[PDB]
Amino acid sequence: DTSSLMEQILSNDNLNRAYLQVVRNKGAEGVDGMKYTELKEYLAKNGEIIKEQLRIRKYKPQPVRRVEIPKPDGGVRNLGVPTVTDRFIQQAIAQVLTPIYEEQFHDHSYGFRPNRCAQQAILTALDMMNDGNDWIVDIDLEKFFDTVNHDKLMTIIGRTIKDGDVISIVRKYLVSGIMIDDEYEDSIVGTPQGGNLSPLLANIMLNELDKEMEKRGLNFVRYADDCIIMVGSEMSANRVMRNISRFIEEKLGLKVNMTKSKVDRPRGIKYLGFGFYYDTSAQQFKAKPHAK
Amino acid sequence: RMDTSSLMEQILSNDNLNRAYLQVVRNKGAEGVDGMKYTELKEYLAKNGEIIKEQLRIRKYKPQPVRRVEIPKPDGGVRNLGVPTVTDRFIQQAIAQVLTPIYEEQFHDHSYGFRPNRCAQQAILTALDMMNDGNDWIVDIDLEKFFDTVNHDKLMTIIGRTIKDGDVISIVRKYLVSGIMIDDEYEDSIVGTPQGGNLSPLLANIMLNELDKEMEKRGLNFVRYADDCIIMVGSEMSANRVMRNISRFIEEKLGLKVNMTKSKVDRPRGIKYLGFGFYYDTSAQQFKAKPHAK
Ligand SMILES: [K+]
Ligand SMILES: [K+]
Structure with missing residues (x-):
């Protein structure tokens, strides 16, 4: 039964873990200019407002901030950096979905x-x-994220995830521009930005x-x-x-x-x-x- | 579950030895001091496997010294390896197959x-x-x-806290003296099968x-x-x-x-x-x- 996952995502236990991970991961600011060092106070003030918006499908992710990174060979690596609030919410979602899908992979x-x-x-x-x-x-x-059809991807996800509130927010994150940090192609090990x-x-x-x-x-x-x-x-x-x-x-x-x-x-x-x-x-x- | 006072017979079982043979052949590798190629091990064991088993049971099996092999590193310089004979790689693998699961639960x-x-x-x-x-x-x-400096008695004392089979203790100590060593190619970012390991x-x-x-x-x-x-x-x-x-x-x-x-x-x-x-x-x-x- 995957029809009631949103409250697991929004539990204080899950959100505290997501907060701690996001601050551990640090990272550049997104489009709103908020630093990871500001997330704690921001959530103290607005966390219940954000949870309410998510529960009623009125939370709107911010677009990712596009960053261009020079490559050794003269190319450019593209990164899409979510706001730190969106990194937090994404992490909260992923903490719940990851164990579900680990069983399938x-x-x-x-x-x-x-x-x-x-x-x-x-x-x-x-x-x-x-x-x-x-x-x-x-x-x-x-x-992948430059070519995938969102309807096809959400249809696949919906075969496992029956909670429409989770489907809704995941689709909104696709629209926001989330993408895969490809620095592993240069043999880099470490936390991906925006991942x-x-x-x-x-x-x-x-x-x-x-x-x-x-x-x-x-x-x-x-x-x-x-x-x-x-x-x-x-x-x-x-x-x-x-x-x-x-x-x-x-x-x-x-x-x-x-x-x-x-x-x-x-x-x-x-x-x-x-x-x-x-x-x-x-x-x-x-x-x-x-x-x- | 195995009995840590009676592990030699597990090491020498048909199932364990077949698996050790398969792994050593899969690992390939250079020859040791006897010049025996990995493709020659099966025929050698057809003739000598029961002899080797019996020698191990009475602590009369004699490991051969490792062969010192110098090979190029990809980026310059030379790597020195100590290559056991393929027979010794086989016996080492047979021992390790029994000891590994025990120690994985301690590590x-x-x-x-x-x-x-x-x-x-x-x-x-x-x-x-x-x-x-x-x-x-x-x-x-x-x-x-490690193998240039470890005190053999100290190492065998630690092992003996878990491994109570004196026949296993005996052969492990003889492999120390044979010169087994650790292939350090991971220091050069290399991924793949080590030699002599x-x-x-x-x-x-x-x-x-x-x-x-x-x-x-x-x-x-x-x-x-x-x-x-x-x-x-x-x-x-x-x-x-x-x-x-x-x-x-x-x-x-x-x-x-x-x-x-x-x-x-x-x-x-x-x-x-x-x-x-x-x-x-x-x-x-x-x-x-x-x-x-x-
Ligand atoms: K490929
Ligand atoms: K060190």
């Missing part, structure tokens, strides 16, 4: 999940490669991909919207590339960049900041940070 | 090295949370290499678990990966106190060796740990980590 999904990290994905993939599955299908997706709820939502939809791959008996790892599939031959890899790309676009409504997607051997793959090499003493593929 | 949640489903990045994440809670004076004790890292964790318990008793915030520990403290004064107290415990109680010149108290930006450095992200107002220059 696949063991080879590693991104933005409790006690999981990029290095675990790498080690799982290496074990598959060293078992002979060293033709890699590297499907490149356009940014209390968006990565979970992406994992809910991409769990459908995990289930399709599992139905096909495929060897894969996934970290948010970045998946690699380990296959035993070039011919099979090309078939997998075609079949899974079609599934992603047709069933999930996401966009595959076919130019950036490729079939290659491990030495050609860059994944989660790592490259791969064959250790000729161990007789094993291994991984290490790729040049940036 | 501390902030120990991350050479343990199932754990990795260096988890240690980094835990440390970053401690740093960002204000514990940004880092006690960085540098230990000389089926038993040695577990033994190091058994001893260093004594340190973890002491640090936990003292309420300290730490992470540890094999013999590489950092401790996160709230002030320089407290860090100097922790440095003094914990270094003394390591040397006096565990008999390990601190390197005076390389142990220090520093802030995160001066720490290199498991291939990572630490930095202050000005936008996030937080410490984060990324691979340090190699």
Whole structure:
């Protein structure tokens, strides 16, 4: 029964934990200019007003603040920073939804999940490669929150979450522009900015991909919207590339960049900041940070 | 549940030995001093497996010395490995398969090295949370290499508190003398199967678990990966106190060796740990980590 989750989200126990986490996470200000050091006093004054607005679906998230971060290669990393109030509410929601979805998620999904990290994905993939599955299908997706259809995503979420008050606020956060901090691509470890709820939502939809791959008996790892599939031959890899790309676009409504997607051997793959090499003493593929 | 006074027969069971064989073949690796390739182990065991089992039962099995192997590091320089023969990797794995589940239930949640489903990045994440809670004076004790310095009697005494099977104690001690060691390629940010590590890292964790318990008793915030520990403290004064107290415990109680010149108290930006450095992200107002220059 998921029809009455809002009061769990709004319980004093859950909100106190969310507050403490958000202040621990610090982070830049959102569009309202409020610093994380101001949240305590703000909630002392306005917390009951905010809870009331959420209960009646009259709370309006602020748009995320768009920040551009220079990349080492001359590109730009885009971040969407929620206000600290919205980080708090997002964290409160995620604390309740995370345990629900942890029961559904696949063991080879590693991104933005409790006690999981990029290095675990790498080690799982290496074990598959060293078992002979060293033709890699590297499907490149356009940014999840730039391309996902909100109606499709909310429909998937609603298969589990029956509480319409929670559905309503989650949709409003999609509209506000929440997104995935991709600094892990540069081998960075640490708290993502603006990531209390968006990565979970992406994992809910991409769990459908995990289930399709599992139905096909495929060897894969996934970290948010970045998946690699380990296959035993070039011919099979090309078939997998075609079949899974079609599934992603047709069933999930996401966009595959076919130019950036490729079939290659491990030495050609860059994944989660790592490259791969064959250790000729161990007789094993291994991984290490790729040049940036 | 197994009986810790009667573990040798569990180690030597068909099921355990088949699993150990499978894992050693999956791990591949270089040959030891006998020149035996991992693909030759099965035929060797078809002929000699029952002989080896019987030798182990009477404490007459003789481990071969590890082979010293020098290989390139990806970024320059050389890494030195001590490679057991594939037979010894097999027996080591068979022992470890029985000891690991016992010790996994004793170990501390902030120990991350050479343990199932754990990795260096988890240690980094835990440390970053401690740093960002204000514990940004880092006690960085540098230990000389564990297997170059550990006192065998002290180690076997600790093991024997749990493992009451004298035949297991006997073979573990012989593997110490054979030169088993810890592949340190994680220091270069490498992820993948270590060489020569089926038993040695577990033994190091058994001893260093004594340190973890002491640090936990003292309420300290730490992470540890094999013999590489950092401790996160709230002030320089407290860090100097922790440095003094914990270094003394390591040397006096565990008999390990601190390197005076390389142990220090520093802030995160001066720490290199498991291939990572630490930095202050000005936008996030937080410490984060990324691979340090190699
Ligand atoms: K990919
Ligand atoms: K250290």
